[PDB]
Every structure is written in structure tokens, then in C-alpha cells.
């Protein structure tokens, strides 16, 4: 399963096993970057399985062709994965100037 900027407002069911990923295209803003809550990222039902985070901002005023800040959670356990990724300035993030992503997926 894979998520992308459109999934910023998605509700879906997923199949797992390989990987259940959540990727953002960044959309380089003005300091904000996509994190879960900022600096920290968590995957649900993680212990034996877990999430990797990898974010690549090519640009900062437009888009470096393929802005790509992703969150890859590898888990297999019957649960619902609500992915709220917060697009803020990593060193602070303006309380109401930061965006956020949210896909509602069922990871099992």
C-alpha cells in the first residue's frame, strides 16, 4: 500500500506484508517539512515491525521536480492506520501555519 499527497484526505483499506507506505511530495513551503508530529514518527503496532522515515526536499520556493518526503511503515497486524503527518518548520512549526496530511487506511 502506498500513500501520496492526494491521500492527504483519503479513507481506504490496505493490504500489508511487503510495506505499507505513506509518501509526501513535500511541496516545499517556506520552512515547513512533513513529519508525523515533528521530529518524531511512529507506526501503529510497531515492535516486531516498524516505520522508516525518509524525506528529500529538492527545493524550497517551488519544487525540485520530485519533492519527496516519505514515511514507510512496515507492519502486519489487524488495525486501523490513521496517518496524520504534520507539515511544519521542524525546529518549531507555526501553530496554525503548518499543514497536515491525513490518510485513513486499514493496515492488517
Swiss-Prot record:
Pfam families named among the record's database cross-references: Inhibitor_I42 (PF09394)
Sequence motif BC loop, residues: 27-32
Cell cycle recorded as keyword: no
Chain ranges for the short sequence motif DE loop as given in the UniProt record: 57-66
Keyword rRNA-binding tagged: no
Motif FG loop per record, residues: 89-98
Subcellular location: Flagellar pocket; Cytoplasmic vesicle; Cell surface
Membrane spanning residue stretches: none
GO molecular function terms attached to this record: cysteine-type endopeptidase inhibitor activity
Entry's Gene Ontology cellular component terms: cell surface; ciliary pocket; cytoplasmic vesicle
This protein's UniProt keywords: Cytoplasmic vesicle, Protease inhibitor, Thiol protease inhibitor
Principal location listed in the UniProt entry: other
Family the entry assigns: Belongs to the protease inhibitor I42 family.
Swiss-Prot/TrEMBL domain comment: The BC, DE and FG loops form a tripartite wedge that blocks the substrate-binding site of target cysteine proteases. The BC loop interacts with the catalytically active cysteine and histidine residues of the protease catalytic center.
Self-association and partners: Interacts with cruzipain.
Function: Cysteine protease inhibitor. Inhibits cysteine protease cruzipain.
Protein name: Chagasin
Organism of provenance: Trypanosoma cruzi
Gene: cha
